[PDB]
Amino acid sequence: VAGGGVALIRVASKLADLRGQNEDQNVGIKVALRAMEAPLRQIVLNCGEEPSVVANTVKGGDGNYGYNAATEEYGNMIDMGILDPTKVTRSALQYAASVAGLMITTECMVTDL
Amino acid sequence: AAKDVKFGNDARVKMLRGVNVLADAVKVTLGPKGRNVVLDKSFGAPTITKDGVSVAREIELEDKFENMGAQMVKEVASKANDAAGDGTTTATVLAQAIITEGLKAVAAGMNPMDLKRGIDKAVTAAVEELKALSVPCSDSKAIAQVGTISANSDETVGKLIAEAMDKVGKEGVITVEDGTGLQDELDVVEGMQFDRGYLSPYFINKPETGAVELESPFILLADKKISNIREMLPVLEAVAKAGKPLLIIAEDVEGEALATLVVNTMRGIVKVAAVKAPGFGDRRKAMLQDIATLTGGTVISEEIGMELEKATLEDLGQAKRVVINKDTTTIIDGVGEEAAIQGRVAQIRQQIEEATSDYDREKLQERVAKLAGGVAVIKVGAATEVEMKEKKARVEAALHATRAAVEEGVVAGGGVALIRVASKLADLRGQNEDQNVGIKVALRAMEAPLRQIVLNCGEEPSVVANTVKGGDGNYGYNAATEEYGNMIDMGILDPTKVTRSALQYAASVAGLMITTECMVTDL
Amino acid sequence: AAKDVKFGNDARVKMLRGVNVLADAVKVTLGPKGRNVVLDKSFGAPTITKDGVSVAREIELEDKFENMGAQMVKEVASKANDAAGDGTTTATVLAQAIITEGLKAVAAGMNPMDLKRGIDKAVTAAVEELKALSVPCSDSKAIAQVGTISANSDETVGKLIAEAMDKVGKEGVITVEDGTGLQDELDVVEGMQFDRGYLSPYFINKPETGAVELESPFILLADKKISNIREMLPVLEAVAKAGKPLLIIAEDVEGEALATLVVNTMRGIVKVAAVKAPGFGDRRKAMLQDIATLTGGTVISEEIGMELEKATLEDLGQAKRVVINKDTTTIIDGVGEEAAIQGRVAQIRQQIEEATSDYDREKLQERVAKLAGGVAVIKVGAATEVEMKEKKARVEAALHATRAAVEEGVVAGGGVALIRVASKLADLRGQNEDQNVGIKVALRAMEAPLRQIVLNCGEEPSVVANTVKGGDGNYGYNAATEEYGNMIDMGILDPTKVTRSALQYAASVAGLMITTECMVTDL
């Protein structure tokens, strides 16, 4: 899939109408879709560029349109050879959501004095 | 003590800390969504305010060095408000910005003198750019538009200003007074104004604005230098008997016995203010005459053998009111003799006709302009004393904003003009790389005001700044409505003079501070 | 200075702590089952009280920041009592509630400005709701019912109020004095009242109520601004010779020499009080005339060449008694000339007939109303001096409660009206989510008073509140009898004006405090 974090951004945009059983579930859905932009934003931030501007521009186009952080030029991620195995992207997302889900609910904590 | 002395980076971190406290306290009030600041008072309940100038006035730090940093920025930034009637908080925000990044570069090993040359260059060009971006404000339509904008969109205040300015000239002297009822009043009166402020700041009267008002004062004109009270006591006694305040216009009042007593002693018994006579040399004498005839009083000159010891009340002139400030004295209603005043104006008018040089003619007509010009008095009327007092404040504010506007124009407000001119100067360079980072330091600092304003809005300042910069002309962000658009059309603007003064003064201290290697203070 | 400066959440926790001390101390006294509070006195034995206003007056904290928080809420909440004659403790309880939850949201990252907008909206709608829930109190039957209710169900007090109001109008000036025996007395007397309080709080006389009473004082009318004692000494001497106190009604008294001596010096030698002349502009002069004729004295105007230096006793007016407070002066029995007073009233009556505008007519008749209106004096009689003094207090209280009632109606007391209007506003929303939590913050805060009241009853506040909210109309909980029912029928009500003022002022400080980013105080 397109690298540079664009695959997850395209996926997130396709899920804009996804809803759950209640408002709290809807917030959870939004939390996840928002986190899906984080990878592209951090890549840009590490470049010394502005995350929101680049994110906004990538979301503006579609398909394999993305930001090439090496050359700091927009273009077709596939044509520029910036690809990620679908397997690593999928795994990164599932393990992140898995541990995040666990953490979320902590009623009480117990530890050694 | 014995002193404590600091050098280089040590003195650097100290000043930066003192500046950050001052700037951080003051800048919270910036913008339409500015936050409040609570200033404790021993006098009673704390004061909740959004007036950045009031906050700054209260800032004093414990550490002697840090306090020096804060007092430096406070002194220069205050000059902006004095000059353009506004600009102090923006000056502080900019100063903090230039100083923060300047010192970082200095600490990175860059040459302080170069960095300052760069900062200075960027400011020179930027001021040129602001001048270009400015929109003139001359016609009465414009004058009124600016006036109402300043009076929070009050069509009546704009009208008042425009009317007063039309009836007395755009550069004429206009005062604002309490109304006698519901209707506003405007009347040109026999008066004058000269660039001479109070000799002692301790002369400040009820007007919290840093001025002094004197109702029906006795004007004392003496071209002598009064250093001792002895030869003036008789006059003071007579004035005291009249219960009326006194205005002393002398060559100069020395703080030996006169200014000493006049201040330290007259803290309630009498109301006495002192100012220097206008001009110097022979002109000083001539002008005093103009003032004398205008107020109907006579000047005491040792040349003629005049003795202040014998100065009776009839020698003293009088005016309905007199307002003195940091660097100006305005005689609002001289009790002079109409014909006498007209006689002098004519006498000087003749002198101008028989002048033998440009310099003579110029100064001669500047004098007739003062006498023959008069003062336009605005009387703010309203339905209730509260409304009247509130509107009056608005008129005073709008009047200053407008005068500044007629002088140098108007520019996109909301911190947009500064971020605009900065986006243009992206290719500016200097004699060398240090000078270059100096230039960049200033340019980035020019974005501080808008970013602060957007910060108080709970919005992302780097996003709005990025957007405003990408635009062109007077296109900016309206923090009031929180929408982008044409700042001028949206009626969001500042007199080009305040934005200019703010930037220049801010760069001034920032430069001095960046090129300071040693600080000395008591232990 | 050297100052101590705090920003954001640091200043937040500080103010919250100062507010919690003040509110928790004062709120223990809330409701029929309110607890006592012991206030130490160096003067002797401690005072045991349930008067929340007295407790608040004693609250000062050691920490400069926390004390700022407490003094802020105290200042605003006190305005409620001043405005509606009650509401201070409720104002404090509400303020604490809004501030507590508001700051939590702020600390949670919500936008302070939005939160305040939300709070402000809920209060606007809520006040509308209270206005709707209100029951008018105009007919003498109603006036008496409210009066007795306020006088702890004393039919006689209600009668007195209703009688006085009927004999002088519902918005007429009514005073309460000691009786001459067993029977109550009521007599309208030549008098007047204007909205002008004492210039210096240090003028407070024996009346612990924060007022000043002057028996047979000499009224001094001068439209000049008296800043120095010099030109007034002769008068003061003459007044002193008379042994009678003095009331100075001038344009304004400046704290240079006059107000300085009048207070700092006259701490026992004489009884002098000073207040500003009513109105401004030309009206200020006219009104002074009314007061002059009313008291039989003459006004000293520089315009006419009047000199205070020559102001003899015959120029001074006189009245049987004068009562001045924070923002009002009441001339109880002017020694004026009946015919003269009638002459003026007629003269002004004529002016009204020949008025050329609504504004002129309005103000003109406001003046005749004052002169032709008079003062209704209630003389509280009883069997014993103790009873007389106790009943008198009740009459004074009931009088204020009733006046507030005629002005804006009455609503379910016991903290039920606020919890009522709140239950209605459950669907209210704003421009955004922050604004929404702002709205919720206010609505939840509206339950604080009732919950406190029920807390002091040893009952479960969340159960009672839940029940009262589930009901409708004036259905609530009677904490006296500890049973539910119709508050109005149970005679448990508050003037809609106090509930309104309490909520508005409470939301005012809560808003300011929630949008405060920096606090400055001396180290």
Swiss-Prot record, chains B, C:
In the record, the effect of E75S is given as: Complex stability is significantly decreased.tuberculosis
Q: What happens to this protein after translation, modification-wise?
A: Phosphorylated reversibly during heat shock. Can be UMPylated on a tyrosine residue by SelO/YdiU, probably under stress conditions.
Q: Which CDD domains match?
A: GroEL (cd03344)
Q: What are the N6-acetyllysine sites (modified residues) in this protein?
A: K116
The cross-references to InterPro entries, in alphabetical order and at most eight, read: Chaperonin_Cpn60_CS, Cpn60/GroEL, Cpn60/GroEL/TCP-1, GroEL-like_apical_dom_sf, GROEL-like_equatorial_sf, TCP-1-like_intermed_sf
Q: Impact of changing E460K on the protein? A: Temperature-sensitive lethal mutant. At nonpermissive temperature, the rate of general translation is reduced and a defined group of cytoplasmic proteins are translated but fail to reach native form
- What does the entry report regarding how activity is regulated? During the substrate-folding cycle, the two GroEL rings separate for effective substrate binding and chaperonin activity. Ring separation is triggered by ATP binding to the trans ring of the asymmetric GroEL:GroES complex and avoids formation of functionally impaired symmetric GroEL:GroES2 complexes. Activity of the GroEL-GroES chaperonin complex requires Mg-ATP. UMPylation of the chaperone by SelO/YdiU negatively regulates its activity, and may facilitate survival under stress conditions.
Q: Which reaction does it catalyse?
A: ATP + H2O + a folded polypeptide = ADP + phosphate + an unfolded polypeptide
Q: Which GO terms describe its cellular component?
A: cytosol; GroEL-GroES complex; membrane
- Isomerase as UniProt keyword: yes
Q: Which residues carry this modification: N6-succinyllysine?
A: K33, K50, K116, K276, K320, K389
What functional role does this protein have?
Answer: Together with its co-chaperonin GroES, plays an essential role in assisting protein folding. The GroEL-GroES system forms a nano-cage that allows encapsulation of the non-native substrate proteins and provides a physical environment optimized to promote and accelerate protein folding, probably by preventing aggregation and by entropically destabilizing folding intermediates. Also plays a role in coupling between replication of the F plasmid and cell division of the cell.
Record's subunit section: Forms a cylinder of 14 subunits composed of two heptameric rings stacked back-to-back. Interacts with the co-chaperonin GroES. Can form asymmetrical complexes, composed of one GroEL and one GroES, and symmetrical complexes, formed between one GroEL and two GroES oligomers. The asymmetrical complex is the functional unit. It was suggested that the symmetric heterooligomer may represent a transient intermediate in the chaperonin protein folding cycle.
The record's note on its domains? Each subunit is composed of an apical domain that binds non-folded proteins and GroES, an intermediate domain and an equatorial domain that binds ATP and is involved in inter-ring interactions. Forms a large central channel that appears to traverse the entire length of the cylinder with no obstruction. The central channel of GroEL functions as two cavities, one in each ring, that are separated from each other by the crystallographically disordered 23-amino-acid C-terminal segments of the seven subunits. The entry and exit of polypeptide seem to be restricted to the apical end of each ring.
The record ties this protein, via HAMAP family, to: CH60
Family classification: Belongs to the chaperonin (HSP60) family.
Instruction: Output this protein's name.
Output: Chaperonin GroEL
Q: Which gene codes for it?
A: groEL
